[PDB]
Amino acid sequence: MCLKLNLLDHVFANPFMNAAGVLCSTEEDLRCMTASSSGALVSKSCTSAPRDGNPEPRYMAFPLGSINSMGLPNLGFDFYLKYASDLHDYSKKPLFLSISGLSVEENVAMVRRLAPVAQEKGVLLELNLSCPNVPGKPQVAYDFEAMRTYLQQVSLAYGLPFGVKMPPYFDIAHFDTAAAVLNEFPLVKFVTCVNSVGNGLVIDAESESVVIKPKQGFGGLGGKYILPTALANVNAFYRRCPDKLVFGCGGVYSGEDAFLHILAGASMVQVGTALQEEGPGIFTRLEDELLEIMARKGYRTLEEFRGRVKTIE
Amino acid sequence: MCLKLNLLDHVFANPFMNAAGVLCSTEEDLRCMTASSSGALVSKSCTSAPRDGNPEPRYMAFPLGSINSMGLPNLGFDFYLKYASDLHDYSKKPLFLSISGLSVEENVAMVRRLAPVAQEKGVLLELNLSCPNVPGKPQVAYDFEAMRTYLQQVSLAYGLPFGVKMPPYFDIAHFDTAAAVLNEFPLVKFVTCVNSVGNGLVIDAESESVVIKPKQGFGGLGGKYILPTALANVNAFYRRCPDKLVFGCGGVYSGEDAFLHILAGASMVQVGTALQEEGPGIFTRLEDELLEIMARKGYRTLEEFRGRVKTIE
Numbered sequence: 001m002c003l004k005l006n007l008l009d010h011v012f013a014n015p016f017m018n019a020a021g022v023l024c025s026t027e028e029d030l031r032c033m034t035a036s037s038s039g040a041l042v043s044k045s046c047t048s049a050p051r052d053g054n055p056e057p058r059y060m061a062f063p064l065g066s067i068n069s070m071g072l073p074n075l076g077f078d079f080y081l082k083y084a085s086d087l088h089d090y091s092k093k094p095l096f097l098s099i100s101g102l103s104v105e106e107n108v109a110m111v112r113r114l115a116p117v118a119q120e121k122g123v124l125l126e127l128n129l130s131c132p133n134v135p136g137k138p139q140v141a142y143d144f145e146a147m148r149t150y151l152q153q154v155s156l157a158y159g160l161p162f163g164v165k166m167p168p169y170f171d172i173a174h175f176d177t178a179a180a181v182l183n184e185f186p187l188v189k190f191v192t193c194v195n196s197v198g199n200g201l202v203i204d205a206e207s208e209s210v211v212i213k214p215k216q217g218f219g220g221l222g223g224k225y226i227l228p229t230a231l232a233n234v235n236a237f238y239r240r241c242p243d244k245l246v247f248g249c250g251g252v253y254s255g256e257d258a259f260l261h262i263l264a265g266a267s268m269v270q271v272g273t274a275l276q277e278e279g280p281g282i283f284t285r286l287e288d289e290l291l292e293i294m295a296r297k298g299y300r301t302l303e304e305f306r307g308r309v310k311t312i313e
Numbered sequence: 314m315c316l317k318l319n320l321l322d323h324v325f326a327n328p329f330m331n332a333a334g335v336l337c338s339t340e341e342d343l344r345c346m347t348a349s350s351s352g353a354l355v356s357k358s359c360t361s362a363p364r365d366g367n368p369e370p371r372y373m374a375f376p377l378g379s380i381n382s383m384g385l386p387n388l389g390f391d392f393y394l395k396y397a398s399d400l401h402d403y404s405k406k407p408l409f410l411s412i413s414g415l416s417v418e419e420n421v422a423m424v425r426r427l428a429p430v431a432q433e434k435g436v437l438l439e440l441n442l443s444c445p446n447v448p449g450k451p452q453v454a455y456d457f458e459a460m461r462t463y464l465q466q467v468s469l470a471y472g473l474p475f476g477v478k479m480p481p482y483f484d485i486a487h488f489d490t491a492a493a494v495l496n497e498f499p500l501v502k503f504v505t506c507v508n509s510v511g512n513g514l515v516i517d518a519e520s521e522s523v524v525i526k527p528k529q530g531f532g533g534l535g536g537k538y539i540l541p542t543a544l545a546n547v548n549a550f551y552r553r554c555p556d557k558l559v560f561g562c563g564g565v566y567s568g569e570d571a572f573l574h575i576l577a578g579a580s581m582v583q584v585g586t587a588l589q590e591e592g593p594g595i596f597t598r599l600e601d602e603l604l605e606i607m608a609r610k611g612y613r614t615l616e617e618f619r620g621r622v623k624t625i626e
């Protein structure tokens with residue numbers, strides 16, 4: 001009894017991977033994720049140039065989850081491309097590379113360079129649509145016209161199957177509009193739901209202070225706070241995008257939580273906060289726990305229950 | 314050392330009140346809230362006509378919060394207006410009346426008839442800007458043009474100070490836009506942040522089923538899930554609407570949670586899920602807990618620390 005699966009013309013030992021930004025920024029981090037029991041890894045979202053990121057403290061965690069305003073600290077696209085082209089051991093697991101350029105032009109420039117390495121090595125593109133839009137505008141995925149433009153331009157520039165990382169939505173009309181945008185693109189083969197629940201605010205009662213420095217304490221939420229939001233987004237897109245895969249991300253701390261994401265429609269399951277807090281050992285625990293729940297239920301495959309969440313009446 | 318506040322030309326023994334929809338639908342519910350130690354009460358959001366609402370189960374709660382798709386079950390506006398006009402004992406505490414018409418015209422119709430009772434008896438209007446709009450469009454407060462229309466028409470029809478109940482937002486740009494529209498309306502004297510985090514999806518692992526019947530299990534989230542989102546919204550509106558009060562709602566289970574709301578800017582503090590789960594005894598607990606935090610810190614009044622959350626240098 002094993003959790004291996006095939007998706008996107010690649011084979012995966014199991015459905016687990018890190019969430020972009022967690023344990024993926026440096027060569028050391030990518031080596032560590034490659035040595036783990038995860039089924040796959042994704043790199044830190046990158047920009048054309050290297051970035052320091054925001055001032056610290058910029059990440060904090062708590063029993064219910066985490067808040068972050070990292071600000072895209074990363075080693076720059078040239079580094080992640082070199083990792084993909086020369087350093088990653090593809091015999092170990094598949095690699096996804098996440099791109100988050102600060103404009104459409106920057107994303108086009110990066111994807112034009114990724115394509116031959118994708119063809120040659122099989123690295124997979126996850127395009128982060130929480131990439132910053134023009135300042136004073138909402139993030140790109142919350143601006144449907146910008147979202148359509150980015151995908152038009154990337155599709156043209158890249159020319160190969162890719163995926164998109166989405167922020168959560170909270171309104172059924174918005175599910176309908178977003179999914180319709182995505183379904184205009186046939187090259188968009190997976191949709192990762194969700195990025196962090198945007199612009200939360202954690203306050204410490206003892207000190208009377210916010211807990212992160214950037215943005216007056218405001219940052220994206222992850223972890224237990226966001227599991228029902230994550231599940232809703234996974235299912236909403238699973239129902240609306242029948243010709244795409246959905247990748248679940250948000251609130252996974254256990255094999256039960258992974259099971260819920262798969263029931264909702266997830267094909268891979270990404271682990272952010274919990275992985276940041278527990279370290280890469282979490283992947284063996286998650287696999288064990290997911291296999292235990294499967295065995296108790298009599299399920300011998302992921303396909304037997306993916307997307308099979310039951311509704312009432 | 315007291316929790317008492319004087320706002321909107323009323324006196325409140327303490328900041329706590331129910332959140333609209335919890336323990337406020339029937340005469341029995343309103344008498345129970347009136348008998349409690351809460352500093353105020355709000356009625357169930359109402360429609361012109363009495364509504365059966367969405368099929369059951371439509372509310373469920375869990376250790377980290379609740380999900381609901383109630384569907385505005387309510388006794389109809391005439392009932393709540395009679396309660397305000399004839400039944401409520403204003404010597405016990407102030408009353409807010411929440412309205413949630415299904416069109417701008419329905420809201421106008423109700424506020425025209427609430428006005429004279431507001432003027433004579435001092436009932437306070439809370440206008441719910443999550444009232445559903447045209448289906449397939451986003452909820453009113455996620456459609457800024459619709460929001461502006463509603464506020465123009467209700468301001469003209471009512472002609473008295475009122476407040477609004479807002480959904481949460483998740484973008485810095487989005488928060489600014491909400492402030493920009495509300496600040497067009499001088500009669501909007503309070504902003505209640507937040508209504509339920511929309512369209513989440515709770516799934517029971519054992520039964521592999523969603524837990525509420527309407528909308529294929531989708532529903533609004535409250536409780537521990539939503540406290541950092543709530544705080545963010547309170548503080549974002551508190552900073553952007555300096556001539557308005559902000560009332561906090563979301564994730565309050567303890568005096569410590571209330572203290573964080575107040576540090577973020579809240580003047581009243583509303584209690585939804587936790588009151589649904591614990592019952593009205595919660596109010597004496599919250600008062601005692603808030604007073605204990607104030608005593609440890611040497612604060613004698615709420616204005617000492619309201620809006621005084623610290624940022625990092």
Ligand SMILES: Cc1cc2nc3c(=O)[nH]c(=O)nc-3n(C[C@H](O)[C@H](O)[C@H](O)COP(=O)(O)O)c2cc1C
Binds near residue numbers: 072221222252
């Ligand atoms: C420290 C940190 C950095 C992150 N950076 C990125 C990023 O570079 N790209 C991205 O797509 N998402 C980023 N995320 C979002 C996560 O990939 C994930 O979508 C979110 O944390 C929710 O998953 P969780 O509940 O498991 O944390 C980051 C999250 C954290 C906590």
Ligand SMILES: Cc1cc2nc3c(=O)[nH]c(=O)nc-3n(C[C@H](O)[C@H](O)[C@H](O)COP(=O)(O)O)c2cc1C
Binds near residue numbers: 507
């Ligand atoms: C059962 C239920 C019914 C609700 N009905 C309404 C309503 O009629 N009008 C409204 O403005 N908010 C309604 N809400 C939202 C709450 O007022 C509150 O904004 C939300 O539950 C978050 O607060 P909490 O975290 O304390 O639950 C309802 C919530 C629940 C749980």
Ligand SMILES: COc1cccc2ccc(CCc3c(C(=O)O)[nH]c(=O)[nH]c3=O)cc12
Binds near residue numbers: 069100128132
């Ligand atoms: C300049 O880039 C940013 C400034 C401030 C906030 C940011 C939030 C998100 C992002 C995109 C990268 C990312 C980050 C981040 O690097 O902050 N954190 C997340 O949880 N998700 C993400 O997708 C860039 C930001």
Ligand SMILES: COc1cccc2ccc(CCc3c(C(=O)O)[nH]c(=O)[nH]c3=O)cc12
Binds near residue numbers: 508
């Ligand atoms: C017909 O009215 C509705 C149908 C389906 C979902 C709805 C959700 C919210 C509302 C507004 C009333 C309300 C409700 C409600 O009555 O469902 N629940 C909340 O958590 N907040 C609210 O403001 C009406 C709905």
